[PDB]
Write a protein that binds this ligand. Structure first.
Ligand code: CHL
Ligand code: CLA
Ligand code: CLA
Ligand code: CLA
Ligand code: CLA
Ligand code: CLA
Ligand code: CLA
Ligand code: CLA
Ligand SMILES: CC(/C=C/C=C(C)/C=C/[C@@]12O[C@]1(C)C[C@@H](O)CC2(C)C)=C\C=C\C=C(C)\C=C\C=C(C)\C=C\[C@@]12O[C@]1(C)C[C@@H](O)CC2(C)C
Ligand SMILES: CC1=C(/C=C/C(C)=C/C=C/C(C)=C\C=C\C=C(C)\C=C\C=C(C)\C=C\C2=C(C)CCCC2(C)C)C(C)(C)CCC1
Lengths: 48, 191, 78, 236, 205, 343
């Protein structure tokens, strides 16, 4: 309950970033049509 | 299938448009019962798809809802209003007589033909363009009709039940009501 | 608590009497002469069955689903 | 450098002069950008392996955050801080770009994994790159620290709280890849360094630019008094 | 074999492959396979709801009394309200998704694997089965896929069984404990710990 | 370009990984290829000419504490690999461990249906079933995905690189081999016997039931006619890869002159200094067949097509005897000795 709990937490706070970065880094990825699509979605939703 | 995980009732082996394994009451055991049900189904679909926008779009204009548009007949001197305009023949016995002879005759013209396939898909003068050219597309064309028609019937049920729950309401009026506070205006408040 | 609550209290008990008695008759049914084991009740066998009526609603409802609570057309004799 | 400078010069004028009334409806809007700009521009920056792309993420994707971080919170008591931070950022960015151009030309690679051992072959370039990188990190004696500081101290002094905390947190987060490349500089495991830094004939213009741009990433952070006294006379 | 009743022999059908096979079913409630096969899941679903359920009852009242946070008693939670939550709609909402997840599980036991061959994309792979009816771990239901499906299933499920069996009892405690004490569960513990020989169910009556 | 291999298992299922490493160093020339394996497996990489330096992280436990986890990721990531090709049949949890290593091309094996079939989206070229039975077929997917998949590179670049070609450093070849040899009888004219008992000899990770050991009575019956005749006249090397100081006292292959040695997976040199070898299906088979080293393999039956593909190694030198009963501990030991007496 020291290595398995609080060490687990103090690593998962620095480990979840290592996963989230590469996870959100592998959406889109080129294909300029996708760039423009994701650029239009935000413009459209921001109109609210 | 409608219910992933149940075996198909043996008498529903595709072989039809809009057939997803749903016959829990075994109503379609008899093939003769089976075929006539298809007729009533497509008709109940066919009429419903016409009626829903005719219930809604007038409410989307200054015109009254699908309930108010029948009310002048209640009073003895009723005269109609189409697009607000007092059509001369709007008195109840007038339209009723016009309604009866026309509806019966054309609907009797239905009752006097037995293909029986044309009793579901007449086409021809009812297909002035001939979308039936591509049998593949036409077969899918039935699907769209069936699923949309089934969709219409439920919307019709929602319209009518919302009226019994909320007398003197409109479906768009009901819609906006929920749209104010969806979390305090729901079907939760009826029971 | 005037009718419904006492009423459910009865229906629980009534089955317990009903369900236990059914188990015993079935239990002694497969013997040389079930006549003797009913006028001279087997007390021990009726003791290992007397609590099975604590869970009669659960047990019976499974019998009904499994279709062993009833028979179909074999009635007299066997 | 210049795209960001010109865009941030046009934005404040195009949003402050003809948009008196809509403040409460764009102050929020820009905020929604900033809170995202200093997050999505850092996470990805961690996973990078190319130098130019990592610089794109960190030095632009993020650092275009705390500049904005006062445009929302501005009663004309903050614009001085934007001017000062821009003056710091130009230098602390051109230094590392000069170092990167020089090393890339001298070797012929861009990916991070080739900067190993560079401290031993040529220590001056490694030092003048580490200085600018740490400054970008925002450590006390350097200039980026005082930049971010005077950007927060005027911006916490204007009420808004859920933007300074995120800024400090993402700065702490940004420390990571800076220290990563720094660690990759200092090393001596001869059997690890690729045969890129191994053949480096160490050694005008680029040297001059790099050396006069890197000391401006350490001195003004401590000599910001006249810069501050100058930047306060802005009314636009 | 270490049954529940040392002297008594275990019944013949509780062979022991099921985790937590402590030869205990006195009333003859599992002497038919199809019966017994459908009973195991009940204990699995009950225990899991009864594991979280006690913690929600327990932890919430623990944090409130100490003072870190504030929440009403689980007894008093049913009437709670913050905003945009008609208890009407929530019941319907919860009935919907739970109805959705419960059924598709029911279809799995009714028809194994007849749950992950369909049209709807991107998820039609995980909800196949965990390969063990009561353990539908997939690469969505076990996002930290950390099971080998055979070995620990004897030695780890036996933890989850004896964990649950305890937890189902514990919840039954609070219901009766709140029914008599009119108070919180820890309050019951705090009261009894004060004067144990005077704070007992004999005195509570 | 840098490459990292994450091969799993012990010795016998890791010694067969040399073809993949050679195919890597052949397709992409001048590539630094590192490897991470288990403690018992890393011992094999002390005889090779491709890998840069090995490591040890994964016996692939369940818990392993979340600081030895991060630091492992913290040493894979901070050297910037390019294609981290893997084994151990990643599902959906172990796939993340490859994914967080921010390389370019993640290729590995996956579970068919069991253990959360999964295989994730964040991968590339996931393939065939799990338990990895056959030998020299082995990673058979890998010797096809790395073959001409891309470009004007010649037609499939030397399909399955020459079989195991392990090298021996002359330092280890001389000093330790000599010291252990001459401890007891030694002429470079002896015969190695490997399968004795069961602690951690090689265990092959795949044979399952047979080849783990013989009851040491068949070994005595074989050995009594091994040195019989001036053919070797040296060989009594029961070669126990065990705690055999717990076994040497019971060598009913009478302890008169039956010598014995303790060894790590270094025994390749000891094979190379023998005059042959006779053993069951174990690492000794592949090691002897790698060099000329005429071997005699005795496994259960018909598993040859799984564990021994090069039936003719050099001259059909390495010969195999099966067991009609199927169980290894019953064989025509008479015909076995007949075959052995020639070498
Ligand atoms: C399934 C477990 C479950 C249990 C054991 C209870 C039991 C309870 N609910 Mg409850 N609820 C439960 C689920 C749910 N409730 C509610 C909605 C409500 C409401 C609105 C209220 C309760 C209330 C109560 C309490 C009734 C007072 C009493 O019994 O005096 C002995 C009691 C704690 C009442 C309460 O909190 O009074 C203090 C109350 O007003 N429940 C919903 C959403 C429809 C549930 C979803 O499953
Ligand atoms: C009155 C309208 C009506 C009629 C005549 C039918 C008739 C039919 N439907 Mg159907 N259906 C309807 C409304 C109707 N449906 C609505 C509103 C929905 C949406 C919920 C559906 C959804 C539906 C599905 C999903 C499927 C059918 C199917 C069928 C066919 C076989 C089932 C059967 O015998 O039902 C006979 C029904 C009646 C006699 C109506 C009884 C009304 C009860 C008594 C009162 C309530 C049959 C031709 C199945 C089929 O094979 O497709 C062709 C099939 O898979 N329908
Ligand atoms: C079977 C379908 C159906 C039926 C029975 C009705 C029935 C009716 N519609 Mg209607 N409608 C329909 C479909 C239908 N609608 C569709 C599909 C549309 C979309 C174009 C409309 C659009 C519509 C409008 C815009 C109005 C009506 C109105 C009316 C009512 C007066 C009819 C009238 O004055 O003479 C019949 C009219 C002609 C023959 C022309 C009557 C109850 C009126 C109303 O709301 O009443 C107050 C009106 O102003 N309808
Ligand atoms: C979106 C709804 C929809 C769709 C997809 C179709 C589709 C079709 N209808 Mg149709 N229909 C609809 C609504 C629809 N209908 C409504 C509301 C009415 C009233 C009708 C009345 C109608 C008739 C009277 C006929 C069709 C026919 C057809 C088919 C050829 C055209 C095709 C399957 C014709 C057909 O079967 O072609 C052979 C045909 O005879 N439909
Ligand atoms: C066909 C689709 C459809 C749609 C889009 C709606 C939409 C709506 N209905 Mg509704 N309704 C429908 C069918 C539908 N209904 C049917 C078939 C019935 C008969 C059972 C009802 C009976 C009904 C009642 C009695 C009430 C609503 C209400 C409402 C509104 C509140 C939110 C809501 O959905 O309530 C939830 C609606 C349902 C759960 C109905 C089933 C919907 C399925 C998916 C179709 C909303 C505008 C409420 C309202 O007006 O708010 C003030 C209200 O009091 N509906
Ligand atoms: C195990 C005992 C048992 C059970 C399960 C039933 C079950 C049934 N009887 Mg019944 N019956 C029994 C004993 C039992 N009987 C005895 C002993 C008598 C003689 C008095 C009757 C006389 C009787 C009549 C006259 C009628 C039924 C009817 C019925 C049916 C409807 C229920 C009802 O009306 O209850 C009737 C309940 C009574 C008449 C009360 C007397 C039953 C006693 C109190 C229970 C005896 C239990 C046993 C002695 C305990 C054994 C314990 C064991 C461990 C030793 C149902 C199938 C009715 C029917 O046909 O409906 C379809 C009906 O008309 N029964
Ligand atoms: C079966 C499990 C279960 C159920 C049905 C509930 C039910 C409830 N919890 Mg709860 N809880 C549980 C487990 C559960 N809890 C566990 C395991 C924990 C962690 C120990 C918590 C921690 C927790 C806190 C901290 C709070 C609640 C609250 C509540 C109530 C409001 C709903 C809510 O949280 O907002 C909606 C929840 C969403 C996830 C959306 C509701 C009665 C709140 C309360 O007391 O309301 C006044 C509250 O403050 N719960
Ligand atoms: C405690 C322990 C020791 C375990 C242990 C285990 N669970 Mg379990 N589980 C628990 C609580 C616990 N769980 C609770 C409280 C819930 C409800 C939230 C679940 C829901 C759950 C599911 C849904 C699954 C497990 C699985 C597993 C596995 C292993 C046997 C998984 C498994 O066995 O996959 C093969 C699996 O499918 N459990
Ligand atoms: C599921 C369960 C409890 C789940 C609890 C939940 C969800 C709690 C939810 C909440 O608290 C939170 C989370 C937050 C609150 O704000 C809201 C509520 C709602 C208050 C208990 C099961 C409790 C179930 C229990 C205790 C079952 C006991 C069964 C026994 C003893 C049977 C024994 C036998 O059947 C055998 C074994 C063999 C036979 O032969 C012999 C006999 C004896 C017949
Ligand atoms: C709700 C309510 C009510 C009503 C009621 C009713 C109306 C009912 C009906 C009912 C019915 C209509 C019923 C039917 C039935 C049928 C049947 C058919 C049954 C059967 C049964 C059985 C079969 C059983 C058996 C058994 C058991 C299980 C136990 C005991 C033993 C024996 C074996 C006997 C009132 C108003 C009063 C009041 C309020 C409440």
């Amino acid at each position: 309950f020291d290595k398995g709990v609080i060490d687990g937490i103090t690593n998962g706070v620095g480990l979840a970033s290592f996963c989230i970065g590469e996870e959100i880094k592998y959406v889109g990825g080129g294909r300029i049509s996708s760039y423009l699509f994701f650029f239009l979605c935000y413009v459209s939703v921001f109109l609210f | 299938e409608w219910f992933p995980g149940q075996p198909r009732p043996a008498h529903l082996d595709g072989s039809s448009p809009g057939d997803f394994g749903f016959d829990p009451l075994g109503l379609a055991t008899v093939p003769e019962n089976f075929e006539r049900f298809k007729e009533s189904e497509i008709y109940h679909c066919r009429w419903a798809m016409l009626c829903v926008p005719g219930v809604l779009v007038p409410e989307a204009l200054g015109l009254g809802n699908w309930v108010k548009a029948q009310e002048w007949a209640a009073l003895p001197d009723g005269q109609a209003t189409y697009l607000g305009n007092p059509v001369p023949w709007g008195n109840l016995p007038t339209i009723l007589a016009i309604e009866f002879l026309a509806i019966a005759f054309a609907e009797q013209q239905r009752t006097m033909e037995k293909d029986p396939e044309k009793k579901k898909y007449p086409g021809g003068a009812f297909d002035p363009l001939g979308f039936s050219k591509d049998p593949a597309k036409f077969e899918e064309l039935k699907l769209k009709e069936i699923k949309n028609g089934r969709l219409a019937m439920l919307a019709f049920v929602g319209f009518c039940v919302q009226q019994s729950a909320y007398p003197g309401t409109g479906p768009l009026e009901n819609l906006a009501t929920h749209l104010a506070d969806p979390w305090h205006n729901n079907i939760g408040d009826i029971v | 608590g005037e009718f419904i609550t006492p009423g459910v209290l009865f229906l629980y008990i009534a089955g317990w009497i009903g369900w236990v008695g059914r188990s015993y008759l079935i239990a002694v049914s497969g013997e040389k002469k079930p006549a003797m084991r009913e006028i001279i009740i087997d007390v021990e066998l009726a003791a290992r069955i007397i609590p099975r009526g604590f869970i009669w609603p659960v047990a019976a409802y499974r019998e009904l689903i499994n279709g062993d609570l009833v028979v179909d057309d074999a009635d007299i004799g066997y | 450098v210049t795209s960001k400078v010109a865009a941030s010069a046009s934005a404040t004028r195009i949003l402050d002069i003809p948009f008196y009334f809509s403040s409460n409806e764009w102050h929020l809007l820009l905020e929604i950008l900033a809170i995202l700009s200093m997050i999505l521009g850092n996470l990805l920056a961690i996973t990078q392996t190319s130098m130019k792309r990592m610089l794109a993420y960190s030095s632009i994707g993020q650092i275009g955050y705390v500049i904005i971080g006062i445009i929302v919170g501005d009663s004309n008591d903050g614009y001085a801080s934007m001017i000062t931070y821009m003056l710091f950022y130009i230098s602390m960015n051109l230094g590392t770009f000069a170092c990167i151009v020089l090393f890339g030309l001298r070797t012929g690679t861009d990916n991070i994994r080739d900067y190993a051992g560079l401290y031993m072959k040529d220590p001056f370039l490694a030092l003048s790159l580490a200085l600018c990188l740490l400054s970008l990190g925002g450590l006390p004696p350097l200039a980026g620290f005082f930049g971010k500081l005077y950007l927060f101290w005027c911006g916490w002094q204007a009420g808004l709280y859920f933007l300074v905390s995120i800024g400090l947190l993402t700065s702490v987060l940004s420390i990571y890849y800076y220290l990563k490349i720094i660690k990759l500089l200092m090393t001596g495991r001869n059997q690890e360094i690729t045969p890129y830094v191994r053949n480096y004939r160490r050694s005008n213009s680029i040297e001059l630019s790099m050396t006069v741009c890197v000391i401006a990433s350490t001195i003004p952070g401590i000599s910001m008094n006249p810069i501050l006294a100058i930047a306060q006379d802005t009314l636009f | 074999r270490a049954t529940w009743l040392p002297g008594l022999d275990p019944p013949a059908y509780l062979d022991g492959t099921l985790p937590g096979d402590y030869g205990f079913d006195p009333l003859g409630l599992g002497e038919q396979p199809e019966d017994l096969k459908w009973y195991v899941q009940a204990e699995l679903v009950h225990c899991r709801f009864a594991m979280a359920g006690v913690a929600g009852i327990l932890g919430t009242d623990l944090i409130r009394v100490s003072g870190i946070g504030n929440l009403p008693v689980w007894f008093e939670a049913g009437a709670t309200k913050f905003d945009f939550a008609n208890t009407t709609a929530l019941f319907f909402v919860q009935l919907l998704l739970m109805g959705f997840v419960e059924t598709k599980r029911y279809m799995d036991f009714v028809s194994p694997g007849s749950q992950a061959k369909e049209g709807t994309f991107l998820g039609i792979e995980a909800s196949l089965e965990g390969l063990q009816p009561g353990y539908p771990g997939g690469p969505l239901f076990n996002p930290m896929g950390l099971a080998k499906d055979i070995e620990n299933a004897n030695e780890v499920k036996l933890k989850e069984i004896k964990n649950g069996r305890l937890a189902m009892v514990a919840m039954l405690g609070f219901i009766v404990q709140a029914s008599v004490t009119h108070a919180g569960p820890i309050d019951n513990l705090l009261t009894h710990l004060s004067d144990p020989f005077n704070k007992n169910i004999i005195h509570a009556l | 370009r840098r490459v990292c291999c994450v091969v799993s298992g012990g010795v016998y299922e890791n010694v067969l990984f040399f073809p993949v490493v050679q195919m890597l160093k052949d397709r992409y020339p001048g590539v630094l290829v590192d490897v991470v394996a288990s403690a018992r497996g890393k011992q094999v990489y002390e005889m090779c000419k491709n890998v840069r330096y090995a490591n040890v992280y994964d016996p692939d436990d369940e818990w392993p504490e979340p600081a030895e986890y991060t630091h492992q990721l913290g040493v894979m990531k901070n050297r910037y690999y390019d294609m981290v090709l893997s084994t151990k049949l990643a599902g959906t949890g172990h796939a993340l461990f490859l994914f967080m290593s921010s390389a370019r091309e993640k290729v590995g094996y996956v579970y068919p249906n069991v253990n959360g079939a999964g295989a994730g989206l964040f991968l590339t070229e996931m393939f065939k079933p799990a338990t990895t039975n056959l030998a020299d077929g082995g990673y058979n997917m890998y010797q096809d995905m790395l073959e001409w998949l891309g470009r004007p590179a010649k037609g499939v670049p030397q399909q399955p690189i020459p079989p195991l070609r392990v090298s021996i450093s002359k330092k280890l070849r001389a000093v330790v081999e000599d010291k252990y040899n001459r401890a007891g009888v030694e002429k470079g004219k002896y015969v190695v016997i490997h399968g004795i008992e069961s602690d951690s000899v090689a265990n092959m990770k795949s044979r399952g039931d047979d080849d783990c050991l013989l009851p040491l009575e068949l070994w005595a019956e074989i050995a009594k006619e091994i040195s019989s005749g001036g053919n070797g006249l040296r060989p009594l090397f029961v070669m126990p890869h065990e705690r055999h100081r717990e076994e040497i006292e019971e060598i009913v292959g009478e302890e008169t002159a039956y010598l014995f040695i303790t060894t790590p997976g270094q025994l390749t040199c000891l094979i190379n200094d023998s005059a042959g070898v006779v053993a069951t299906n174990t690492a000794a088979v592949q090691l002897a067949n790698a060099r000329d080293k005429p071997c005699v393999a005795l496994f259960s039956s018909k598993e040859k097509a799984r564990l021994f593909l090069p039936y003719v190694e050099e001259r059909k030198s390495c010969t195999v005897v099966a067991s009609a009963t199927g169980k290894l501990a019953g064989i025509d030991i008479e015909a076995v000795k007949k075959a052995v007496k020639d070498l």
